[PDB]
Design a protein around this ligand. Structure first.
Ligand SMILES: Cc1[nH]c2ccccc2c1CC(=O)N[C@@H](Cc1ccccc1)C(=O)N(C)c1ccccc1
Ligand SMILES: Cc1[nH]c2ccccc2c1CC(=O)N[C@@H](Cc1ccccc1)C(=O)N(C)c1ccccc1
Ligand SMILES: Cc1[nH]c2ccccc2c1CC(=O)N[C@@H](Cc1ccccc1)C(=O)N(C)c1ccccc1
Ligand SMILES: Cc1[nH]c2ccccc2c1CC(=O)N[C@@H](Cc1ccccc1)C(=O)N(C)c1ccccc1
Ligand SMILES: Cc1[nH]c2ccccc2c1CC(=O)N[C@@H](Cc1ccccc1)C(=O)N(C)c1ccccc1
Ligand SMILES: Cc1[nH]c2ccccc2c1CC(=O)N[C@@H](Cc1ccccc1)C(=O)N(C)c1ccccc1
Lengths: 221, 221, 221, 221, 221, 221
């Protein structure tokens, strides 16, 4: 991450061992379950692209995912370059160059250049921009390693409603969908794919009911 | 959370890895037992809505609960909007907008906007307001995942009184009730649902006795 | 707890995750053995009543005890109110009210009010006053969950003296007694309830002997 | 590592116990898998050559590797000496000497000399230079303890594509290759060495496809 | 422990949870082996008598020892009182009283009084004085729970010399003895109680030999 | 260790619980393997002789070693005294005495005296001098508890070369030898004591080959 030093200057903070071990443990234990993302985001708050790279490099295994991640990073780095053309020429002495997509991703930029941009007034938030891309890739990975689709989730004959909902929202959390699509999957699927005895009750509760109500209503069978 | 920096400015504090791992462990180990709430409250002291969101996002599983939580958040966000109408128009340059319910819940607001409100003089405590709502939802969850009601708690024939009381107060802690309702459940149920041998003794101690006294009095059988 | 900020002002310190997890572990592992009290006292040093409440709320189980604890808190809160009558009227604008027993216990007081009192010049140490009450209740709990009395502790025929003493002082630590009563239990019981072979020796050492001496003297049989 | 003290002066920071234990655990658990490198780099940020030496010295076992490491360090130290000839003579009183390769590697230099160079204006970044060499050696070790070559990686008849890719990129991460060579191994091998059923599909997707697409396309068989 | 605050004043530092848990673990795991003492001393550096009391109170079990500890504390507190008579009278308003033995042991003194003495110019180091007494008691305990005497340590027929020495110095570390007595036990016992084959060799090495030499000399049989 | 306080003065830093527990764990788990030394050195950076003593005192067991350690300390303390004669006389009021060997080892010196010397301008680095001696003893211990000599290390008929080298360098790390002696053991033994099939190959590589090359060359059999 980054802080201002004793005096005026602005210095890099080494990522702690705890922050590191935590990120590695998350991944060993949770693979690419959705909750990994928040965790990465949390553990990376204030990060430079180096740091972010570091963090990603500390994962062993999941290299298929990691390659998808790079391709997503790449995809975005191109789009950045296209929206912000740079001017290759005489870079005015000790004066800051404009970052390219590769400079944001850390491949063509130093830590010192990175800090430089991040603490500029006004700042170029290269860490956050790189972070946004990384999370994009992380979503994709999450979808890809979701073993089931929302359409394959039906309540079991003898499955309490609470657990169907659990499985449904869990599955739903791991989908490619805008918010509007998830909403739609909910409105269409949740009641439809409930089992017969509970489905009848819920049809009767009508479309304005809360989940608390739905669960209450299917409690007794 | 939030602190004032080296100099005048007011900066975000990343939630630590310990605070994170602790919240995740709590939930893996305790599901939605009542004590989870304090723990969440403690681990979240000083939090911005982002942070709170982060914390909630780091839980995998319990997605039925988490959906109830959102609906409760939503319910409250509406009520806020209704009690505080905002004026959509020209937001005066670099000047702070009034938060909506969605801005409090973090969905339509940035961290920078959030800090802004939290450290304003006089402040809009958006973290505490969002926290209050989240705890509301957390109570509801707690009730919903309580597998037994206070009325189903009777002392076993051969159950020491100490343990009946344990089960009764534990059950009672997980109920929807104002303080006045819990009091009432106590005054009506605790002695009534004690087993015969202990019940006689307690009727004889009379209604002003403490629990220490009650336990003392049923010690010997 | 509480500290003075960067500048002049006096701010709340969130109780750490370590302090929290430690208190929870203590109780899971030790129930209400005497040593729990020091531990609570240590983990709570500098605490506001909120914090103390937090800590107590984080224990799941032991709810019979916790109810005794509240009754003891209540008992004390009444006594406080009786010794310090407050004047209900126009609370002079932004000026500090006198705390009631409920304000000390945290039920009718905010954190901000609490800090206010704790850092007043001269201060009202509401945390320490609430702490003293809580420890009182904690003693009572300790006595109540002590499964044996000092009078039931006799040295086994083939029990080395060292271990009898261990059991005796352990039992003695968990009693309701002033210091003078414990002293008395010692002077009357320890030698009397030793087994015959060791008892004879100790009668011969006479009443001024130390425990080191007593143990030395019963070493050889 | 290094920080500026209370006042003007610039002082050494002891490497923490956590940073140490973490590095030792990494190696016990992961031997010389690629991810070890980032970890070492992370745990060593800001390090003086002493510290780096310390860290390396704390590994027991892997002494064949460690000897390769020294030889690589040595190789580099020579190259440094050759590119930067020093002038042996009267070292001007309390004035800084130019570092040799051995002074960078820590063998002929003190901590005080090391700090001196690192915080000079303009600085001689001896820690980073030594770090770069150490990582070079660490790469070599990584290659040497890679038990399989990229050419020996073929998808199993009944191996989902996802896992072949995993094994391929993992193997590829542990190779001696410029970026251009890895690219080349990819373009030549990945599709070629896929199993027949998946290979046909991928030939049909054509050379511009992403891995996400490739995995999508071989999903269904 | 104790530190000077933000501004001029001198404030108490709560003993950390780590320092606490560490002391409790030491004792659960090591009982009263000699090394416990250093550990206690280390964990208690800078402590007030409250803190020290706290630490001692956090041990459950070993109550026979703990009672010996109090008697030793008591013994010393008396001796202090006798060497430093106090003058009971009008304690000059807000002016510091002279500590008694009970004030040093914490029983008749507050934390505020304790800090007061510890940071006085010139200081009364009540923590160190109480610490010295506590360690005295701790030595005694150590001796008392040493199950074997230095005279009972003979090298086994087939016991390598290294291990005899280990057992001998370990036993010797747990004895009541001035330095001069330990020296004497060494000079008299170590060689004498070695087994015949090794004893002959050592007699021949003569009285100026080091242990390194002794071990070298008995290596080969 | 040591730091300058809030204001001008220079104060002792208690060794942390983590630094302590870490040193104890190292030794329980690793006995006197070579890597223990770095670890001790790392964990002790900035230490006063008290602290160092503390650390050594916290090890239980290994008392034969610890006695060798003292003798080595003693040996060195004598040599110091002989090279720096002190003048016993009127020690000029509140003025610093010259340290003896016993004052460096901590036996005749206080912490306050120790800090005094360490922070003097110009300083007497008593911690580093004592540390150097302790490490000397630690080397000796390491040699003594090395169960095998470099001459007894031959490659197994069916032992990959990598593992022979591992065993050889590991053994070599635990020897009494100047750098020049180790070099010599290498040049003479490593190839000579390799097994026949690998030995022939290595003779053919010639004396300038690296270990990387040697391992490469014996890879294939
Ligand atoms: C955890 C989760 N499950 C989902 C299933 C489908 C789609 C999204 C999700 C999410 C992420 C998810 O939406 N998380 C919430 C935070 C949150 C988590 C858990 C309970 C309540 C609030 C979030 O990030 N935001 C901004 C948010 C905050 C309030 C209301 C709605 C959204
Ligand atoms: C822990 C608990 N069990 C209950 C059962 C029924 C209703 C509520 C509860 C509670 C929460 C509960 O009431 N917790 C207490 C704190 C507390 C916890 C444990 C012992 C003593 C004090 C609390 O939050 N407040 C403000 C409080 C403080 C003093 C007296 C009464 C209330
Ligand atoms: C630990 C313990 N066991 C008891 C048995 C009967 C009554 C009380 C106790 C106690 C608490 C107990 O008395 N603890 C001691 C601290 C202590 C603990 C252990 C050894 C020495 C000193 C204490 O709090 N104080 C103020 C104290 C200090 C010195 C002398 C006497 C009392
Ligand atoms: C982790 C990994 N696997 C490889 C296989 C072949 C070659 C190299 C590697 C690497 C290291 C690897 O390339 N790591 C990445 C960081 C990274 C790791 C994981 C996912 C995305 C980005 C890196 O260090 N840099 C500078 C980088 C950043 C963005 C794009 C490309 C490279
Ligand atoms: C650890 C130990 N074992 C003993 C056996 C008999 C008597 C005493 C002991 C001790 C304590 C013991 O003497 N510990 C040493 C520290 C120490 C520990 C281990 C190795 C070297 C130095 C100590 O405290 N001091 C002041 C000391 C320092 C140098 C030389 C001699 C004494
Ligand atoms: C770890 C080790 N194994 C040995 C075997 C024989 C003799 C010595 C050793 C050592 C200690 C050893 O030499 N450690 C190295 C640090 C080190 C450790 C591991 C790999 C590379 C560099 C060291 O302390 N120094 C000053 C050093 C630094 C660079 C080159 C040569 C020496």
């Amino acid at each position: 991450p980054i802080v201002q030093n004793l005096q005026g200057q602005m210095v890099h903070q080494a990522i702690s061992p705890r922050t590191l071990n935590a990120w590695v443990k998350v991944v060993e234990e949770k693979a690419f379950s959705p909750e990994v993302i928040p965790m990465f985001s949390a553990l990376s708050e204030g990060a430079t692209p180096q740091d972010l790279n570091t963090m990603l490099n500390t994962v062993g295994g999941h290299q298929a995912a990691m390659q998808m991640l790079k391709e997503t990073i790449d995809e975005e780095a191109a789009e950045w370059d296209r929206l912000h053309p740079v001017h290759a020429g005489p870079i005015a002495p000790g004066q800051m160059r404009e970052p390219r997509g590769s400079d944001i991703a850390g491949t063509t930029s130093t830590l010192q250049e990175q800090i430089g941009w991040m603490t500029h007034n006004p700042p170029i938030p290269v860490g956050e921009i790189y972070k946004r891309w990384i999370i994009l890739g992380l979503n994709k990975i999450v979808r890809m390693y979701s073993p089931t689709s929302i359409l394959d989730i039906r309540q079991g004959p003898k499955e309490p409603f609470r657990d169907y909902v659990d499985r449904f929202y869990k599955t739903l959390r791991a989908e490619q969908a805008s918010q509007e699509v998830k909403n739609w999957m909910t409105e269409t699927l949740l009641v439809q794919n409930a089992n017969p005895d509970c489905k009848t009750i819920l049809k009767a509760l009508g479309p304005g009911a809360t989940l608390e109500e739905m669960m209450t209503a299917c409690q007794g069978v």
